[PDB]
């Protein structure tokens, strides 16, 4: 049977308003819809497709593991998860890992661990979580309660207790809510969804000192910011501040559902048998693919190529903006970039984005005031230039 | 990179104790480890691998979609999700579906939906969830609080509030906790993890009556009992009692990570734009696979096949039990089967499950007193007999 966009509004729980067109296939940073229209993809499946669409090596790893076995569940380990655990361990501060299937799942694990850890070493009452206004951490009750966007949490109250929000990049705000009762401080190194806003180096370093003083675990939510996105493997390396726990997802599987929690030995020791779990996490399908992703992403060449591409993007966006007077700022790190709208245009991020799509380029928002770019890490100069060309046309169309 | 079982104990957060051997490939209901030892697999990936290991048609569906595109995020829908939704909608009470990555995310979506519906139609005071002791609903903070194993949640307190547990199969225990402050009652049609305990028809009609009297959503957690498992497509069809929400995962994806919330038009209307969502949820790879799974399982020959298979397993577990007197009962429905231990062997299901791995058959537990069988719905007659012969041999060693 034949499928059309109107089918989405009769069949799907109305949680999203997706685009009027329906993608059917893609290669690298180009995607095509059911009528053959071609888009340059700067959405990057919301910062996931780090190698672009239908990558041939990802496919080959996919179809090679798929012809062995896909899944047993965690009664049994497998070679792919173990290899991926090693890669991740060797490449980061981590001594151990847990695999799950989403960014939120990864965050659930991390907040669960810090909680058990605090209880087990200090007592039932050291249960506080500090997070940040505008943070986004997931849509599970706990993660969305840790998130600092109350419009996402209010309807599903009572919310789990002992969660407080401080102002991002505001060290005294944080200091005031962090004490001996705090078990965890969870933070994104760049707030993604809340408008591509990068932590300051003194802010992050400041939470690290606060966590030490109060015996609280510091947790980096790198589901958006990780696996190459900033030009280092993880943004913590860019800042030079090391967390107790790090969560990772999205790009980890370059399009396959996977997530993981990276922990130190000491922290890991806290989670004994049967204290957490997941049916699908650690499957060898996900693991063969993530493994090949890390193998391709975590190379001096690919990562420097991200620093290179950051400059191509910002430079052309600054030139677009000079011509059209749209934004007050282009900010971010690596290939997570925000264009902040000016006073004239504020709250119109989505309309620009819809224009973009009309002009054959896919971009994201990040709040109604930021247009956001999260392209593949291996976008070609040609793809960037022609996508920015069409962005430029959309900006013309929009500004009149 | 060489990989051995001792590596697990150094690389993984020690949340599982898995088998001392490592599977590396499978076909239908046989699996093989790194040294070529062979198993009959009656664990089924814990009730996931409804079509067994490395199924030709599921790989063809994987590879086919894999070569077009994997993922965009939900800013854009796709044809396989929409196809999948339509199949779910056509085959059940549901009018609309939401897609995510795991049974726990399914249960988040359903619990969240019940709460918002209550709040909107009656006031934010109506937040009560009623669950059952020994229930298992997932490892997110909210879902492990809905679940009835306090051991799995206590370490992570404070827990989201307003959750009560009644007694499974005891309509009076339910009745005493469900009132007009109740938003949701969530129940497994067979308690899975907690002992393979089937619900009676009266207990289920009772909750439906009681949910109608008090305006609470009745939620059937069909993540284990779903997708052909019981002999019908979903258990609720066996029992003739219709839920307001139905969650589903495991076998839905044949091994691919997928899950879903199934809802009526009424309840689906409640989730408006931006109120929930997931990065990976509803990607076209998952969707193409589940799509195939539904096609291959929702037929009269498989589902009848599952009734026929139930018979093989039970004629034979009786025979074995005659010889070794191990079990006070054999219970469950279709291909979810619990063998309950006698008081002389109480707490030794795991020991049994180990001796069976040594004998080359994989079986599950479901608490210390049940050996659980969750084989592929397409297991063959030869594969059932061979795996029971080895389960019989294992039973012999265990008894002496
Ligand atoms: C920094 C950060 N941490 C955690 C998570 C949670 O990851 P999941 O893998 O999604 O569990 C995220 C992910 N958030 C991306 C927002 C995804 C959804 N948005 C859309 O579908 C956009 C739809 C549209 O544009 O119409 C959502 O859940 O709201 C993260 O970034
Ligand atoms: C009825 C029911 N509802 C929900 C869920 C949650 O599904 P996920 O898809 O896991 O989020 C389940 C799932 N559970 C089967 C047990 C899952 C884990 N088991 C193991 O890791 C086995 C370990 C071993 O045997 O050594 C777990 O969380 O513990 C469900 O059944």
Of residues A66, A142, A258, nearest to B54 (C-beta):
A66
B227-B230-B235-B240 Cα dihedral, nearest 10 degrees: 130
Q: Is the CB of A214 under 6 A from ligand 1?
A: no
Tell me if B279 and A249 make a contact (CB, 8 A cut-off): yes
Q: Is the CB of A368 under 6 A from ligand 1?
A: no
Q: Is the CB of A336 under 6 A from ligand 1?
A: no
| CA distance linking residue B362 with residue B371, whole number of Å | 11
* For residue B158, cis peptide bond before it (omega within 30 degrees of 0): yes
CA of B73 to the centre of ligand 1 (A): 8
A62 touches chain B (CB under 8 A): yes
Tell me if B59 and A54 make a contact (CB, 8 A cut-off): no
Residue A252 has, within 13 A of its CA and on its CB side, a CA count of 31
CB of A236 closer than 8 Å to CB of A242: yes
Supply the DSSP string of A358-376, one letter for each residue.
HTTEE-EESSTTEEEE---
B156 touches chain A (CB under 8 A): yes
B330 touches chain A (CB under 8 A): no
Helix (H, G, I), strand (E, B) or coil at A318: helix
Location of structure tokens 């994989």 = B362
Q: Is the CB of A160 under 6 A from ligand 2?
A: no
The contacts of residue A154 (CB under 8 Å, 6+ apart) are none
Location of structure tokens 């209901």 = B29
CB of A349 closer than 8 Å to CB of A311: no
Going edge to edge, which strands form the sheet with B370-373? B327-333, B336-341, B370-373, B364-365
Q: Which residue of B has its CA nearest to A21?
A: B76
Sign of CA dihedral A78, A80, A83, A85: negative
What 8-state DSSP symbol labels residue A280?
S
Helix (H, G, I), strand (E, B) or coil at B182: strand
| CA distance linking residue B269 with residue A12, whole number of Å | 10
Of residues A54, A97, A161, nearest to B12 (C-beta):
A97
Look up residue A317 and give its two tokens: 């966006």
Tell me if B69 and A112 make a contact (CB, 8 A cut-off): no
| CA distance linking residue B83 with residue B79, whole number of Å | 6
CA of B46 to the centre of ligand 2 (A): 8
Cα–Cα distance list, A114 to A127, A184, A199, A235, A273 (Å): 9, 6, 22, 21, 16
Instruction: Specify which residues B83 forms β-bridges with.
Output: none
Phi, psi of B372 (to 5 degrees): -105, 135
Q: Is the CB of A18 under 6 A from ligand 1?
A: yes
Q: What is the CA angle B94-B144-B115, rounded to 5?
A: 50
Supply the DSSP string of A200-269, one letter for each residue.
PHHHHHHHHHHHHHHT-EEEEE-TTTTTTTTSSSSHHHHHT---SEEEE-GGGGBTB--EEEEE-HHHHH
Instruction: Specify which residues B373 forms β-bridges with.
Output: B337
The contacts of residue A326 (CB under 8 Å, 6+ apart) are A320, A339, A341, A342, A345, A352, A395, A398, A399
For the structural domain made of B1-54+301-400, what CATH number should be given? 3.90.1150.10
- Set of chain A residues whose Cβ sits within 8 Å of the Cβ of B254: 70
Instruction: Specify which residues A218 forms β-bridges with.
Output: A185
Q: What is the CA angle A297-A299-A304, rounded to 5?
A: 95
Helix (H, G, I), strand (E, B) or coil at B55: coil
Quote the distance between the C-alpha of residue B166 and its chain's center: 21
Look up residue A333 and give its two tokens: 């790190």
| CA distance linking residue A189 with residue A171, whole number of Å | 14
CA of B46 to the centre of ligand 1 (A): 29
| CA distance linking residue A7 with residue A150, whole number of Å | 31
| CA distance linking residue A283 with residue A270, whole number of Å | 23
CB of B98 closer than 8 Å to CB of A12: yes
Ligand nearest to the CA of A101: 1
Ligand nearest to the CA of B363: 2
Cα–Cα distance list, B337 to A36, A142, B359 (Å): 50, 34, 20
Q: Which residue of B has its CA nearest to A266?
A: B13
Measured in angstroms, the CA of A212 and the nearest CA of chain B are apart by 21
A3 touches chain B (CB under 8 A): yes
Q: Which residue of A has its CA nearest to B28?
A: A69
| CA distance linking residue B45 with residue A174, whole number of Å | 44
Instruction: Specify which residues B327 forms β-bridges with.
Output: B341
Look up residue B371 and give its two tokens: 């050996």
Going edge to edge, which strands form the sheet with A217-221? A96-100, A259-263, A245-248, A217-221, A182-187, A128-132, A163-166
Query: What region, left, alpha or beta, does residue B183 occupy, with left being phi > 0 and alpha being psi -120 to 50 degrees?
Result: alpha
Which residue, among A308, A244, A316, has the nearest Cα to A40 in the 3D structure?
A316
A140-A145-A151-A157 Cα dihedral, nearest 10 degrees: 90
Q: How many CB pairs under 8 A join A and B?
A: 367
| CA distance linking residue A167 with residue A371, whole number of Å | 22
Q: What is the CA angle A227-A76-B71, rounded to 5?
A: 35
What 8-state DSSP symbol labels residue A167?
P
Quote the distance between the C-alpha of residue B219 and its chain's center: 14
| CA distance linking residue B262 with residue B243, whole number of Å | 10
Q: Is the CB of B188 under 6 A from ligand 2?
A: yes
Q: Which residue of A has its CA nearest to B30?
A: A69
| CA distance linking residue A130 with residue A136, whole number of Å | 13
> Residues 103..132 of B with a Cβ closer than 8 Å to A: which?
103-105, 108, 111-113, 115-116, 119-120, 124, 127
Which residue, among A384, A391, A385, A382, has the nearest Cα to A359 in the 3D structure?
A391
Q: Is the CB of B221 under 6 A from ligand 2?
A: yes
CA of A250 to the centre of ligand 1 (A): 9
| CA distance linking residue B43 with residue B41, whole number of Å | 6
The contacts of residue B238 (CB under 8 Å, 6+ apart) are B189, B230, B231, B232, B333
Same topology between domain A1-54+301-400 and domain A55-300? no
CB of B263 closer than 8 Å to CB of B276: no
Quote the distance between the C-alpha of residue B17 and its chain's center: 21
Helix (H, G, I), strand (E, B) or coil at B73: coil
| CA distance linking residue B348 with residue B350, whole number of Å | 5
Distance, first Cα to last Cα, chain A: 42
Supply the DSSP string of B99-146, one letter for each residue.
EESSHHHHHHHHHHHHHHHHHHHH-TT--EEEEETT----SSTTHHHH
CA of B183 to the centre of ligand 2 (A): 25
Please list the alpha-helical segments (H only) found in chain B. Answer: 5-11, 44-47, 56-68, 79-91, 103-122, 143-146, 171-175, 201-214, 235-238, 265-269, 284-297, 300-324, 349-359, 381-399
| CA distance linking residue B38 with residue B41, whole number of Å | 9
CB of B77 closer than 8 Å to CB of A5: yes
Cα–Cα distance list, A249 to A104, A160, A213, B132, B335 (Å): 9, 24, 29, 33, 34
CA of A240 to the centre of ligand 1 (A): 26
Cα–Cα distance list, B363 to A72, A236, B50, B223 (Å): 12, 43, 15, 19
| CA distance linking residue A251 with residue A297, whole number of Å | 10
Supply the DSSP string of A88-145, one letter for each residue.
HHHHSS-SEEEEESSHHHHHHHHHHHHHHHHHHHH-TT--EEEEETT----SSHHHHH
| CA distance linking residue B291 with residue B296, whole number of Å | 9
Residue B76 has, within 13 A of its CA and on its CB side, a CA count of 30
Beta strand A96-100 with A259-263 is antiparallel
Ligand nearest to the CA of A136: 1
The contacts of residue B353 (CB under 8 Å, 6+ apart) are B363, B364, B365, B371
The contacts of residue A254 (CB under 8 Å, 6+ apart) are A48, A49, A50, A51, A55, A58, A289, A290, A293, B70
- Set of chain A residues whose Cβ sits within 8 Å of the Cβ of B10: 96
Of residues B10, B13, B24, nearest to A79 (C-beta):
B24
Helix, strand, coil abundance in chain A, percent, nearest 5 = 40, 20, 40
> Residues 256..295 of B with a Cβ closer than 8 Å to A: which?
256-257, 261, 263, 268-269, 271-280, 283, 285-286
The crossing angle, in degrees rounded to 10, of helices A300-324 and A381-399 is 20
Sign of CA dihedral B278, B279, B283, B286: negative
The contacts of residue B123 (CB under 8 Å, 6+ apart) are none
Q: How was this structure determined?
A: X-ray
Q: Which residue of A has its CA nearest to B376?
A: A72
CB of B168 closer than 8 Å to CB of B135: yes
What 8-state DSSP symbol labels residue A72?
-
Look up residue A391 and give its two tokens: 């962005």
| Burial class (CB within 10 angstroms; exposed 0-12, middle 13-18, buried 19+) of B14 | middle
B94 touches chain A (CB under 8 A): no
CB of B289 closer than 8 Å to CB of B256: yes
Tell me if B364 and A127 make a contact (CB, 8 A cut-off): no
Cα–Cα distance list, A149 to A138, A194, B165 (Å): 11, 9, 31
- Set of chain A residues whose Cβ sits within 8 Å of the Cβ of B120: 155
What 8-state DSSP symbol labels residue B279?
S
Quote the distance between the C-alpha of residue B241 and its chain's center: 19
Quote the distance between the C-alpha of residue A274 and its chain's center: 28
Distance, first Cα to last Cα, chain B: 41
Look up residue B380 and give its two tokens: 């063959």
Measured in angstroms, the CA of A15 and the nearest CA of chain B are apart by 4
CA of B137 to the centre of ligand 2 (A): 8
| CA distance linking residue A358 with residue A390, whole number of Å | 9
| CA distance linking residue B146 with residue B197, whole number of Å | 18
Measured in angstroms, the CA of A265 and the nearest CA of chain B are apart by 8
The contacts of residue A256 (CB under 8 Å, 6+ apart) are A58, A62, A285, A286, A289, A290, B70, B71, B285
Q: Is the CB of A73 under 6 A from ligand 2?
A: yes
Ligand nearest to the CA of B98: 1
Q: What is the CA angle B374-B377-B379, rounded to 5?
A: 90
* For residue A354, cis peptide bond before it (omega within 30 degrees of 0): no
Which residue, among B272, B268, B223, has the nearest Cα to B249 in the 3D structure?
B223
CB of B372 closer than 8 Å to CB of B337: yes
CB of B260 closer than 8 Å to CB of B252: yes
Supply the DSSP string of B290-349, one letter for each residue.
HHHHHHHHSSHHHHHHHHHHHHHHHHHHHHHHHHH--EEEEEEETTEEEEEEPGGGTT-H
Query: What region, left, alpha or beta, does residue B387 occupy, with left being phi > 0 and alpha being psi -120 to 50 degrees?
Result: alpha
Tell me if B8 and A77 make a contact (CB, 8 A cut-off): yes
| CA distance linking residue A95 with residue A189, whole number of Å | 21
Beta strand B197-198 with B217-221 is unpaired
Q: Which residue of A has its CA nearest to B72?
A: A45
| CA distance linking residue B101 with residue A6, whole number of Å | 25
Look up residue A356 and give its two tokens: 């973009």
Sign of CA dihedral B355, B356, B357, B360: positive
Q: Which residue of A has its CA nearest to B280?
A: A257
Phi, psi of B296 (to 5 degrees): -85, -20
Tell me if A97 and B11 make a contact (CB, 8 A cut-off): yes
Look up residue B89 and give its two tokens: 């909608």
CA of B173 to the centre of ligand 1 (A): 39
CA of B139 to the centre of ligand 2 (A): 8
Instruction: Specify which residues B365 forms β-bridges with.
Output: B371
CATH topology of domain B55-300: 3.40.640
Location of structure tokens 């929702």 = B298
Cβ neighbours around A15 below 10 Å, total: 21
Look up residue B158 and give its two tokens: 């404070």
Label residues B156-175 b or e (16+ Cβ within 10 Å = b). bbebbebbbbbbbbebebbb
Every domain of chain B and the residues it spans: 1-54+301-400, 55-300
CB of A249 closer than 8 Å to CB of A79: no
């Amino acid at each position: 049977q034949p499928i059309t966009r109107e089918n989405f509004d009769e069949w799907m729980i109305p949680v999203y308003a997706p685009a009027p067109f329906i993608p059917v296939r893609g290669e690298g940073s180009r995607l095509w819809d059911q009528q053959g229209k071609e888009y340059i993809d700067f959405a990057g499946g919301i910062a996931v497709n780090a190698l672009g669409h239908a990558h041939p090596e990802l496919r080959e790893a996919l179809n090679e593991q798929a012809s062995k076995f896909w899944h047993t569940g965690n009664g049994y380990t497998n070679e792919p998860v173990l290899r991926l655990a090693k890669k991740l361990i060797d490449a980061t501060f981590a001594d151990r890992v847990f695999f799950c299937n989403s960014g939120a799942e990864a965050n659930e694990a991390a907040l669960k661990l810090a909680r058990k850890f605090a209880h087990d070493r200090y007592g039932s009452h050291k249960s506080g979580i500090v997070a940040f206004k505008n943070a986004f951490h997931g849509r599970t009750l706990f993660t969305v309660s840790a998130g600092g966007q109350p419009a996402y949490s209010q309807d599903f109250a009572p919310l789990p207790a002992d969660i407080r929000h401080a102002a991002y990049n505001d060290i005294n705000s944080a200091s005031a809510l962090i004490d001996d009762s705090t078990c965890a401080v969870i933070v994104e190194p760049i707030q993604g969804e809340g408008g591509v806003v990068p932590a300051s180096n003194a802010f992050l370093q400041g939470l690290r000192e606060l966590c030490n003083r109060h015996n609280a675990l510091l947790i980096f939510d790198e589901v958006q910011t990780g696996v190459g996105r900033t030009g280092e493997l993880y943004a913590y390396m860019h800042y030079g501040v090391t967390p107790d726990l790090l969560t990772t997802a999205k790009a980890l599987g370059g399009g396959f559902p996977v997530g993981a929690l990276l922990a130190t030995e000491e922290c890991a020791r806290v989670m004994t048998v049967g204290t957490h779990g997941t049916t699908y996490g650690g499957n060898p399908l996900a693991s063969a693919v993530a493994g090949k992703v890390l193998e391709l992403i975590n190379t001096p060449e690919m990562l420097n190529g991200v620093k290179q591409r950051h400059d191509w993007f910002v430079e052309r966006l600054n030139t677009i903006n000079h011509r059209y007077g749209l934004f007050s700022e282009v900010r971010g790190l690596g290939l997570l970039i925000g264009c902040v709208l000016n006073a004239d245009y504020a709250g119109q991020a989505k309309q620009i984005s819809q224009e973009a799509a009309k002009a054959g380029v896919m971009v994201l928002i990040a709040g109604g005031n930021v247009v956001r770019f999260a392209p593949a890490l291996n976008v070609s100069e040609e793809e960037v230039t022609t996508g920015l060309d069409r962005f430029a046309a959309a900006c013309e169309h929009f500004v009149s």
